[model samples]
Target: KDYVVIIGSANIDVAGYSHLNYADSNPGKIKFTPGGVGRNIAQNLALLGNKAWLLSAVGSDFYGQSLLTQTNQSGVYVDKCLIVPGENTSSYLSLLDNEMLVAINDMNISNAITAEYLAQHREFIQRAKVIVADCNISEEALAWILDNAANVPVFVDPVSAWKCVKVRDRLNQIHTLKPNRLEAETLSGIALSGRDDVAKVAAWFHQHGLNRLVLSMGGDGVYYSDIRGENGWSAPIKTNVINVTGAGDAMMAGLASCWVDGMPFAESVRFAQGCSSMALSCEYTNNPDLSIANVISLVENA
Candidate 1:
């Protein structure tokens, strides 16, 4: 079976929406979904046709069971996920500032995703044709993945602005990296404002040995750059935006699918754009119905 390995965080996601801007005083309706950077990508990859194995740690409590049951229906292999006996499941809570997300993550339970856990699974981890990792795992575990996945295509999602620091000095070890504009700036220590600034950021990563870059600009579209210093941009087929959360994870799935299939970079970007578009149209982390046809149709029309 064709396989993709995703190593990172899994969480119980809660999205609270309100018409008014964010304030502790503002009240909103609540909806829950399964989300977290790596987990979303793994589930999407499974639906898109890959034997995805998600490797990470989660608490064995109620929230963990809920997240597990939710992922079980999808084809991702969760048999290997570390379930800590007494810990609470990792969780994310988001308040919509008029549909834009202002979220907080209590992912401390993910600390169980230690280098020791991965050491026990070296054989299984080595079997992946491509590996995707989110920064939610410890920096040591992230470094372990880079060191162990030699000769494999490794893609990374720098999950947050503050968390981007974990992977800052290891760009060379990664084959592909997707970061939002804010994250891109944080990782490179350069403010990205114009085309020039974006290019400079790409140059910085290239100098550090990054091979492919996707600077996710959200609704403005994504900027793509490769080792050759060439660049391009692509966006989803425009539509009324729903929840933008997890759009990037879907985009990461798009890029990973293309990478394993040997598609060109532009196609990868367009494919990812479609995934994000589809995710945005849904109220969930990723469109559960996402498929290769969904992406190909969008690409054909694009």
Candidate 2:
């Protein structure tokens, strides 16, 4: 089986959810879970029965140990990750008022994955059937991976609007890119005004040399376009919402899995949407019960 090599950050997520309106001291549930864009993608891929390798940087602390151990337990290979003894493990804190929220992340430790580290793991990277990268890595490290893995298809997930700019200049090097509405606007510098603007956004990315693009519009579903002249809007499947934090990560995993299976672009979009729907139905960042069969069933039912 060809492994999906995922390179990015691994950290803990601290989330607070409140059903009532926001206040100085909102009473709600506080939860802690292992989460990072790349880590979540790898975990979802592994849960879906794909071989996944996670290449990330974590501080040699309790949180780091927990992240690696739990991710490994989820069936993702973490042998290539870097453990920096002096750095603090990254953590994201977010407060949610129902479904809307704000987050602050301390991810300085992700710098531990330097270009030299990727050089040391070059051979491992070359073995990937497809590579998934999150913008948590430095631009230099991102450039290194993109340049070296030119022969292999590389998929990128811009972790946030601020982080998405890191790959703005390297569009041609990316085989596939997934960006949420905000991140898409941040990257293209083109404001979107409703569903019709999705095609315009896709055109911008393609004009910039991107081979494939998936633009996520939350409940409005996703707009996908590829250089192969295949493009369409895949409507979102209606499902119960629990937590929407990891939906994008799950969607990226599903897209990569479908890529490995040689599924058509349009079909892959639906499958990926199913994966996201499943993630939305879970409170955890990465649903432990996700599988190819479950996703297929979800897609079929839709």
Candidate 3:
């Protein structure tokens, strides 16, 4: 059985990497790759040896075809994705400099993942060992998903600062949540500064029904907590970073891998940190080398 199912967006990503800052002719290379919250985690989970499936929408255009073809080859089951006849395929344009994400311009197209469509897959949602979702889908679909996902172990990723607010009311339904500093502050309505602020925010989210919270702070690593009242920090493994585009997503996938395998929370945070390390150097949105053994190796070394 495919133990994990991801529901979110799929997009073609075009990114420019440069150190000379924005505006004017910055010396860098432009890369095109398949990206999106669900699509990336699907590929990374497959690399970790998890049977993962993707349930998203795609346009019937050239971009969609290529995205589906490549995602299928990446070991994610794409048989269930919606193929809209004339909808626009999602796309992301980004800029990264000095290992920092400078800016991102996106084509909004997640509306194709409708709640009406998801209602048809109730059985699929029920039978899955784990259900993972991002707020890229509309609030209508999110409501339906969170309502049903409460039956299973649901992992939620707040895709961005804006999208994170969509799940603010339904936080109680999520089993785990991976939010970056901005996204977390957006949800918790608190600005995080020192360790105490981070802990306070984690506790605040914990009160709102979140069982597991993984807060990503860029180079500062992750601050995590569970319902058991255990909380600690996970430092990033020192590495030469190429881009910080999908480092947070890599952390999400690694965290899911840990939960699926019943690994300890603290240790899993370290492993997830290793995933960020690996992804920081990867040009792809999902690090090609993401695996339990690779992250474990980094963690052991750390």
**Against the true structure, whose TM-score is highest?**
2
1-302: candidate 2 lDDT, tens digit per residue: 57889998998999888756544676678988999999999999999888999999888787888889999998999988889997778999987765646889899988888899988989889888999999999999899999999589999999888889999999999999999999999988888878888888888899999999999997788989997678888888999996688999999999999999898888988999999999999989999879899889999997
TM-scores of all models? 0.92, 0.93, 0.90
lDDT of 3 by residue, 119-234 (tens): 88888877887888888889888888988764788888899898889888988888889988999899998888766699779888988988899888866767888977998887
The worst-scoring run of ten residues by lDDT in candidate 2 lies at: 18-27
- Write down the lDDT that model 3 would get: 0.82
What are the per-residue Cα lDDT tens digits for candidate 1 across 1-302?
Answer: 67899998998888777747434566667888888888899998987888889997788787787787788678788888888997788888876655545778799967789889988988878888899999988889999999999678899999889888898889989999999889999988888887568788889989988999999876667889999867987754786687677788888998998888888898788888888788888877778878898767866776
Evaluate all candidate structures by whole-model CA lDDT and list the values in order. 0.84, 0.90, 0.82
> Candidate 3 at 61: error in angstroms?
0.7
- Cα error, residue 218 of model 2, in Å, equals 2.4
Residue 200 miss distance in model 2 (angstroms): 2.1
Alpha-carbon shift of residue 198 in model 3 (angstroms):
1.6
Instruction: State the displacement of the C-alpha of residue 109, model 2, in Å, after optimal TM-score superposition.
Output: 0.9
Look at candidate 2 and tell me the lDDT of residue 254.
94
Q: Candidate 3 regions off by >4 Å?
A: 16-30, 95-106
Q: Which consecutive 10 residues in model 3 have the weakest lDDT in total? A: 98-107
